[PDB]
Symmetry: C5
Subunit: 275 residues, 5 copies
């Protein structure tokens, strides 16, 4: 009563949440994953808006403010009960406890991944129809294009490790929020961990599902006035391809996400406490 | 007790609030809508004051600070119980639940819209009688004029999508505040979502009801000293017309507001939880 | 229990506080008004200290930081139970409810006004005896002089409307703090509304009771070294006169304060809820 | 329960705390005063570290950040139960109530003053042995020397009034923290009042007990490399003398501290409420 | 209930936590120490990311932001129940109380130290495999190298005193967090004390266990493109050697850590309260 949960109780509520999320109806899970993807896309839009025009600003300060803005998406995911893949990886605790089977875990992960992708694509369509890429004389679109272009230029091991580091922070934020008992203890304990992985540049698969397709759409369908304003051409971002997106980024970053989240946070604390 | 509300309880308190707001007396609803319009105009005044003179400042940082300042209006609307149209669209949850009829919804929406417009006009009159447009050697009035001029230059589909995105954030902030149990959990969970839509540039109909008429009034009745100080002439803002305001902005942004708020937040969560 | 007060309960605690404040002993009211004036003078000293040297800083950011600093005075007034005139105007709710008479209201308002003036003068004497006007090579005194000089150059209608807007924000902050149940919900819900009216430039009579006499004292009794450092002369601020202070500022700003506070916040919510 | 304390209860808990602190064992009081002096020295070290290199930064912003950093010391003093002289002056409430005698008050004040001085000297020794004065190519030591040099150049009446203003803010912060019921309401209500007196330049005797001896030690025992880096010589700070420290600063600032704290905060509220 | 713990209760919960941590199973202690080292490495990564490119920024502001970012690691250690050596030194309270023996204390300290080192090395390997040292055209790696190089250039007495000061702040933050009763009172009371020791430059042994080996790895295995971008050569950091790391830094900083933490915080408060 009125007290923060101790780590053992944190692990037991994590186990219970894993069982609850794994036993939910597939259609409800799909809808919640769509909302989670929409929230993550909202967070990346805030990040891009905040970090626009900060070239003269110091690198660390601008990235820190961008991460503080980006934490809104995962705060929304936690508060609104949406199913985010980075958070659904933590059902490995319930899997190890034996309360859920491997088939339930596989179905939940697939459903949440697909729903997150659908939500990210829907928000990409909305963002493009809004005309946001011409903000600040095209600097918003240029920021989107540069952010997307940088993510497609990583090695397999580098992408895997970046995904491990990103899902480490996301699952640590979720685990810490498990201790909170109010809307504020479950939101303010989650700004710094997310801001770390956003400012550092760690790669999140769900966030990339919004980022890279947005960059591809802007590279393809931008008006010539946008290119004239930004002083660049589409051939400067030729590497922004769907196949390159899925191959150079999606698979390695996703594999790193599983390895980080449900091996370095879920399983380790299950071993420490719930074994 | 002492715990944040779970999403199912959040949806049920949203339904109950919708029924309560739809069954209120029309005169009380009109007065509360007037207060809500006054609060929204207060928020836009804070935004304009904060963002004045930030041309040299980075775009994202200045817009983020402006949004943080702007969140005060919706915080006031939630705390003081005022009826804001962006929030009254969420009575579609109670409509879908069957607790209220279509006539009640239509009457509530019309009354709240009219009251918000009346409150915005009253605060426009107060702001003009205050002489605030000559602050910082006319940079306050110039900021108001530029903000109003930019909003009148959007396509129908772009305005509709911008309104969808704005009401998405507003209704998401309201839905998240439904989880809080104190004045602080119902205020700090609402700064970031509002700051997102303010910094990004998403269009809110109620906020525009204060913004654009203020710009028209300043364009019409400004002293020649103000124009000399700002180095511009009224013909530079010829497009700032009442008919252009209602046609290019009000109808599309309002339609986008309904489509965002009571289709992408209210109905989706009613389907997920209250069906 | 553990929950924020609903607007009806907020209005009833406002009514009860009005009755309690109107029925207090006159000497206790005088002492509390003196403490309130001291707190308001403390807030203006923080504002001046924070905004010193921010000429190169953007206008909005500097004024926002100054308002955040200024909110300390009204936070102190609320927490410590001091009687501030901007807050005592809200006893019009209890007057309309019939719990107090017109004579009690008049006596309370006069006593609180006189006590606030006495406290502001005492803090002016303390500030002058401290030697603070020579801070930053006289930039503190120059900031005080410019702030005082700008306030004496407003029309009657402009001053009345500025006072209306200022007391609107002050009474709205008090009304919102009525909802809070802890020291933090009653302090953080009060920073933004005060910061708005401070950054915008709205005129508060009690704050001006410290500001303008301080400027007059500095204009009169400053050392020639201060004038040499600031590169100005007393004849540059000839308009800073006590008669000009009371006539151009005190009466119109005070009348606007009553019209804002106990007509646009107190009476409107009494009509909505307590009628 | 769950509610902030009303001013009458705040005064009664202040009286009870005064009796408790006055009736404590002298050795425990001495140890707690040593810890309080260490905490105050920690706060001044944070202030110096934060304000180092901020010459190009605006005066008010840099001093505000320095005060926010400095509030940590008094937050530590309140949370950890240390006996700080600025806080022990408030036992005048219990003295006026008759619960403690004059001898107890005198012994408590002397013991706390001596313990604070001993703790400040111990932290001065630790800071010198750490080698911190060579941080940022000697700018840390130069900041310490300038801060110490400015404090030794005040008139008796100016020093007395500055001490009155400083202890006013410190005792007001303590009195406001008496209302809080958790670690957060007793810490966040204390940042702004302390930041005011730090940013403004009001003189605290305990803080000066760390500041000035540190400056004397740096002036005496600095390496010639430090002087070469800072581009100055010890003769530029000849006035930094122990006798000048105790005569020009310690006695007047301390007398102002008593007059502020236990006449303008303690006795006034005892008269208002506890008489 | 709902109230912050008084200092006597703070000391008794510190004693109980010491007994609990000293009586835990060695393998669980090792795993928790590994997680604590990972969290500390995460905090140093945030610090490096935040402070990258802030050469033009004022020294104090940049170091303050870096410390605010760095506080995340110790917040994670407290919330997640990890065993950090700087925190395990406080079991000297339980040792003095007689509840645990000297052998238990020695075994706990050795196990926690070894686990922290293993976790720091694992995160060093992950950081190197991520490729983070090429961020901002090698400015991230240059910041890491400079931070590591500066720490290897301290005298024995200076390193001992810096460790004393660092563990003072860490143990004071832990002791203050013992008073909090929620996730927020146990996190926000811990940002300022950690930020102090990070901004000032006080040396923490566990943090150095991540910092210096990372610098050695970057100095050894960096690509020539990184050196070309940063405009430097490995011979500029020849002193970055493992033997120099353990001799010039590890032993003196660790000894200072024990002397600070479990003599100046644990034993002093045991003497004041628990004797």
């Amino acid at each position: 009563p009125f007290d923060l949960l101790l780590p053992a109780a944190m692990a037991k509520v994590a186990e219970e949440a894993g069982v609850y999320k794994a036993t939910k109806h597939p259609l409800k899970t799909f809808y919640l994953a769509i909302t989670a993807g929409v929230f993550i896309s909202i967070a990346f839009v805030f990040y891009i808006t905040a970090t626009t025009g900060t070239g003269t600003m110091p690198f660390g300060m601008a990235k820190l403010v961008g991460g503080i803005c980006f934490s809104l998406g995962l705060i929304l995911c936690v508060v609104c009960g949406a199913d985010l893949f980075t958070s659904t990886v933590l059902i490995v605790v319930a899997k190890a406890s034996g309360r859920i089977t491997w088939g339930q875990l596989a179905k939940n992960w697939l459903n949440v991944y697909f729903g997150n992708l659908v939500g990210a694509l829907l928000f990409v369509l909305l963002m493009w129809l809004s005309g946001e890429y011409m903000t600040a004389n095209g600097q918003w679109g240029l920021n989107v294009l540069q952010t997307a272009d940088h993510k497609v230029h990583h090695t397999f091991i580098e992408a895997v490790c970046l995904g491990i580091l990103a899902n480490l922070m996301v699952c640590l934020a979720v685990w810490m929020s498990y201790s909170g008992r109010s809307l504020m203890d479950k939101a303010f304990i989650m700004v710094l961990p997310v801001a770390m992985f956003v400012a550092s540049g760690f790669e999140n698969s769900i966030a990339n599902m919004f980022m890279i397709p947005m960059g591809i759409v802007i590279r393809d369908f931008a008006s010539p006035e946008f290119w004239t304003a930004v002083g660049s051409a589409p051939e400067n971002f030729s590497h922004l391809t769907v196949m390159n997106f899925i191959t150079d980024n999606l698979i390695p970053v996703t594999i790193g996400n599983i390895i980080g989240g449900g091996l370095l946070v879920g399983l380790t604390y299950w071993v420490i406490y719930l074994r």
